[PDB]
């Protein structure tokens, strides 16, 4: 009676995309999309800014495949800036054809970098911009805050030559606040991550399909949104884009690949790599932890998993008659399914 | 807000048929139904066009039991045509009575054959028609496509003497497209198969009860529909027909029978046979796979399982007072149930 | 669009009874109720007409505890009649007191007996009435049928001196058909039984809370209904009565008791008794089977389990302020819960 | 100190056969063997005398494949005699060829039949012999008993025209007692059966490799022995024969085949057939405490495929051991004992 | 009494090596050993002749790491000869250093090739020798057979310029027969493989530690033996060598590496490669199958697994005071442990 229930909110498993009349085969769909209003990608995939997912080796591979990597901020300003320079200066071998590379106007691979909102941020942003970073990601657990909103405005006013992303958010109200602060895109996801315990610790969250819809509906395509967290299968990517996302950010799916940070580890015969939330105890070494720490099976070169995922999205776009990403964003139709489905 | 949710879609487990006033005992119900507007069956069962389910041996057994088999197209044109001749030329032993046999005007067992939409299709259809096939099934993963619609029209205009089925579809819109192209029946099922991973790979699907209803409601009985996939129990068959289906196609339920292709294999003391999606890696050896491959327990002669399944349908029709299949299609009443039941 | 969905139907696990203002303690609640319009019980419990639940030994114990047993029909006419006489003639020892016994006008323990609708039924009913049976249960899987409706009418017209129950049904329409045929009560339950496979084999069923409500709403208390099947806990009994039931029938809960038919068998060091659906292969040994056969753990004397169950019902009536059964039937209020409220 | 431990007794899983110098390929080995001193089989396989394993249908298939079936005795005398006659007079169509059929000197398929030691045994034996049975199996839980010994001698004395097997036994002492009674073979197995609970109920039993060895060592091939119970894999058959068995009897392995008695049951999507010990509760109904269990086995299809697989494994084993004929394996086999780690 | 039990035979899990007085550190031990009397390796590791383990890519990697690969024979003669030549003429690239490479007198990487005893064997041997193969492995399930013994003798008499290995065997008697036939080494292993079902199908086998000991004791170092099958951990390698082996052959350990044949398949979100016995139904497509067919996790570059395995062996040799492989072969002392110590 006094309980304010805004909606019944939906996650990936609550919905299915409907097939529609199609004259496009999966092999012919275009996966080109925009990361921000100023940066386009050749595939809608972004690697998570996590110290077990994205350092320079992953970022290079992501850009070589047409996506982009967000360097995590769990490292010194000098280290993060060197990581940026490694990507911007990377030169492919003489027998290395990457025709879908995501590059800036100077022919250099694109890369992003995460920053916080604390006292070190101005120096960190300056160093990253000096090194040639393409986009600054003001990246916190709660983007709908004075700290994030004002830091986004500060990056936009002081470094207009770089693109800036703000997050994480889960509501249209948060999206409009970041839009008015000057963000070139927003990152959506409070609660969906595979290693998230925010739902348990804080009781806070927004099922990701309804989060994407709420943000996309408010933005009216003024800036794109990145759907961050909860992607377990390629089918989740198609659902996210059909719900309004322009790109997808993944951590678990890229953890354990050769290019992800960390050494492979022998354990019970099998090979593993570490994967941990940035709000886990180890990552933070004050707030109680909001992420778990675990192992993911060794996956080999990231290009394999990326090919599998993009192949699944191509199949979905064939089913929906979507020749280009914007077709899926605009024309997707869903059904809600029950627990039995 | 911008998220288009067409409906909450229901699968078999979401609904139950209600008992109704009955003056018919299960033993006296008639299971006769129509496969296409021109072909009638004595039972509503169709064996899947899969290379672990239906070759000539299964097709003969299906027809002898009053149903029909759809020979899979994972074989050469000449091989598939020889299979058709095997069924059309089959003569039962002089101490074997199959009074419910499904036969053509010439007294030959009926059989169907699957074809695709690619360049080999014209020659394949011509070879199959010449061999005496009763029905051509233009079967793809996505029947709501120009390729399938135009190939169905091509078969109807060029081989009016054969019946043609188009699929697979999941919406009334798709059914009307195939109806207007000349289909004699449509096959319904996107996502429900037991070996299906399309839901996970592409995020695509339609819970099968709502798929049947959407298609049946648009067709208004102008042509019948085949409910293809997701049948695990005889109860599912009754639900599918009550929702509007005229026949049921099954793979898993007939996989592992003696008549299904493949050898029985010893594994942990027990006998199995292989069962795999036609979009599995093995079946395909480029689309990423959308089906799994596994083992199913050995089931002995298919007549046993067919008898069990039809006995359950007879029971259901006794409970609903349905003396003939069309009674169940017209008078079925359902309740929706929760996850607790 | 063409799909006819009558309702979202609820089972026991979908609902909870709400506590209400109470000035009655569980110990002071009255469990008296009516089995039929002419037969009252001292507790709302009926033992199932199953060959692993109710023969004369269970029927005697049920009546002694204030309920009634329905003797199963998986036996010869002379056998079932003898079972009836065993109950009607039973004499308790002068050192055993059962003050709540359910007895007829002659002071004899009450008992019921199931019959079918086939050719043997007229003779079977005649033998059972001759032996003193209190109620005939025309008992089939599908009571909404000409066979059951007309057999109920025949028993009422030819043997007006006995009470008659018809079932099983799951809809108000079926209840009214049996009412018009002269049923003194109806038995409700299509699908809910613990050993049922009808939902899987036939795709047929009605979640039991909605079945009870549909039947009770149509009858408007002209005759009572027996809620048959799916009772796993004492809480299900309160829910069933709150939804409109006057009595509940149980098989699984009384299977494995000392008084149930069958010898104990200890298997892997533990004692069990058989429990099987009457539509199971073994029971029928043609319709495909619609029930399973299994073992239930040994439970000892049935009086204990009956005491546990009625104690749970008494607690619920304390929570709901229900001093008598009819209070719970008339005043119960429910909430619907989600899957997380169950788990 | 006072505890009498005769030996450490070994089961199938305790031992492995060793490879040896070999010149004969598995495809060329001979599987012919003795059932009794007077009856040979073309393969060393006997189907168990159990009402879920062997009636006339199974017995016919066993003989067609070169083995033999023992008809169970859980039926009245007339019924069991009729089962014998069904096997003895079965004629195959000329469209089917069973070149390895096991037949008597008249060209009729061979068959055996079980009898007990109860009061109906004289009439049952007479009826089975009159029906043409090839071998009478005096079949009890405890062959080393006056009852079985006396009944074996009685059959030999009154019906010398039939072969007689006595069992079940587990020691050389028991074997010599049945030999002296006139038995033409002994059946070895107390404890090993898949559905046996004798070990739990009575604390009685003998691991089957040592049982075979104990019996074979005492008999010194004067008569053959049937290794009855505990066979799970073809490898068990080779080990049993290497330990001295001339044939093996199987129940579980042939239960659930098309030819076994009983209808296929549909249970949770899968097909099964019943399999139960003859000392189970249900078997003793239609006063000892039960000593067997009752359950389901997966449906296995035609028994011929199972038999072919088992004999294929034995052919492989004989190739490894350099055994051209069954007697080579019986006389020349070498074993190693393995630890629990070797079994894991 | 008549049962002939040769011994209680031991597998790897039955025994442990004892530490001994030691002066050389693991980093300083020598892992050099001999594959045959004429061929030395820099590490005691051989990749199995299986179509899911060793083709030319794996053989090159084995040789570069100091071991050797045995090319499987499940391919026609021209294909297997071409695989030999691919290894023999492989030339490392610039900035590529493999200081431990195992090479012939001409500086070419070593490689072996399996042959059977079937009708194509004479032509296959001739082609493999002509292609520069270093060792012919006459490889069957049963080396103690006229077929293998006579084929070994044929290779030695007609192609003396090549080394020849015979197997598989499990007894000293078999070892002497192959020695007499002219074998330059024998391969030991009947039953121990990870994918073996010979023990279940045929009841045949010899626990691998006792097999190694029986063979080594009979040979008295006249020729070396390859311990083939059952290796799961680096500790198994040390035990095998301490029991008398000069090299070990592995299949499962190298299956799933990047260099093994076959593509990585995606399954339940994890990556795998096929691994199957050469006696499995899949590989054979008449004997009943004696191996299983499955999938193993993807392991990445084989160099990492080899490095881990050799690291474990170096540790073991540090514990045993073994500065070179022959020290471990000659001086190892064992204890037998119970199933409680294996817990
Ligand atoms: C301890 C916790 N650490 C992290 C770190 C990285 C994250 N990255 C993404 C997301 C979350 C993250 C939480 C949580 C919400 O879902 C997305 C965190 O900072 N908690 C937190 C709680 C409330 C407020 Cl006001 N400020 C911060
Ligand atoms: C690889 C995959 N292979 C199969 C094969 C047989 C099938 N048979 C029935 C069904 C499906 C099947 C998928 C999937 C949908 O549910 C029913 C397939 O062709 N994918 C696909 C995706 C999108 C488009 Cl445009 N075209 C094709
Ligand atoms: C084989 C099956 N045997 C039983 C036996 C006792 C039962 N007792 C109670 C209930 C059911 C029972 C089913 C099933 C429905 O739920 C309550 C049965 O008779 N099937 C059946 C189906 C359709 C029609 Cl027309 N007639 C009968
Ligand atoms: C109850 C039990 N019934 C059976 C029936 C068939 C059997 N068939 C083979 C075997 C056994 C069997 C037991 C048990 C030993 O292992 C082989 C049986 O008769 N017990 C028994 C115990 C002691 C004595 Cl003096 N007499 C008999
Ligand atoms: C079917 C079976 N196929 C294989 C193939 C490769 C093997 N490779 C190594 C090993 C074994 C292998 C068995 C089995 C023993 O352990 C080592 C095989 O040929 N059986 C066999 C049995 C008896 C005889 Cl006389 N000849 C051969
Ligand atoms: O400790 C944490 N708690 C909650 N969310 C986190 C934490 N660390 C990272 N995340 C988020 O989870 C995403 C990874 O989600 P995943 O792809 O489902 O594994 C990241 O991109 C972050 O948005
Ligand atoms: O690889 C595949 N993916 C998805 N659906 C498939 C695939 N192969 C076959 N199907 C469908 O699944 C049906 C069999 O479903 P089932 O009866 O539930 O086993 C077939 O008749 C096809 O419509
Ligand atoms: O074979 C059967 N199938 C379905 N329902 C049955 C069968 N046999 C008995 N029943 C019903 O199940 C009730 C027992 O249900 P329970 O108390 O949940 O064990 C009986 O009173 C009958 O109404
Ligand atoms: O009730 C029983 N208890 C113990 N052994 C039995 C019983 N019934 C049969 N057997 C034995 O078990 C054998 C079958 O063993 P199996 O091949 O391991 O299943 C029969 O041939 C009998 O010797
Ligand atoms: O099918 C088979 N059955 C038994 N042994 C086999 C089979 N295929 C290969 N082997 C042996 O097993 C070894 C590999 O064993 P692993 O290293 O334990 O996986 C090979 O080198 C062969 O000696």
Author numbering:
A (entry chain F), B (entry chain E): 0 to 94, 204 to 393, 412 to 467
C (entry chain H), E (entry chain D): 0 to 94, 204 to 393, 412 to 469
D (entry chain A): 0 to 94, 204 to 394, 412 to 469
Quote from the publication.
GuaB catalyzes the oxidation of the substrate inosine-5´-monophosphate (IMP) to xanthosine 5´-monophosphate (XMP) using NAD+ as a cofactor, and guanosine 5´-monophosphate (GMP) synthase converts XMP to guanosine 5'- monophosphate (GMP) to generate guanine nucleotides essential for cell growth and viability. Indeed, genetic studies have shown that de novo guanine biosynthesis is essential for growth and viability of bacteria both in vitro and in vivo (10–23). Here, we present the first high resolution co-crystal structures of A. baumannii, S. aureus, and E. coli GuaB proteins (cystathionine beta-synthase (CBS) domains deleted), each determined with a matched set of three different inhibitors bound. Similarly, the NAD+ binding region, also where our compounds bind, occurs at the junction between neighboring molecules with side chains from both protomers contributing to ligand binding interactions.
The A. baumannii protein consistently crystallized in space group P21 with eight copies in the asu, forming an octamer composed of two inverted tetramers, relatively rotated to interdigitate the labile “finger” loops (residues 371–381) that mediate much of the tetramer:tetramer interface. We observed a tight overlay of structures across the bacterial strains, highlighting common critical interactions required for potency. These inhibitors mimic the NADH/IMP cofactor interactions by forming strong π-π stacking interactions with IMP while also hydrogen bonding with the conserved glycine (Gly299Ab/302Sa/300Ec) which is one of the two hydrogen bond interactions observed with the NADH amide. The ligand linker segment induces a 90° bend, directing either the amide N-H of G2 and G1 or the imidazole of G8 to form an important hydrogen bond to the conserved glutamic acid (Glu416Ab/417Sa/415Ec) while directing the aryl tail group into a hydrophobic shelf region. This Glu residue underpins species selectivity, because the human homologs (IMPDH1/2) contain a Gln residue at this position that effectively prevents binding. Differences in the polarity of a particular key selectivity residue specifically (Ser250 in E. coli versus Ala252 in S. aureus and Ala249 in A. baumannii) was found to be critical for inhibitor interaction with GuaB which corroborates the observations of previous reports. Enzymatic mechanism of inhibition studies showed GuaBi binds to A. baumannii GuaB uncompetitively with respect to IMP, and via a mixed non-competitive binding type with respect to NAD+. G1 was designed specifically to remove the hydroxy-alcohol that is a substrate of extra-hepatic alcohol-dehydrogenase metabolism, and retained excellent biochemical and in vivo potency. G2 was bactericidal against A. baumannii at 5× Fu/MIC, and G1 was bactericidal above 2× Fu/MIC.
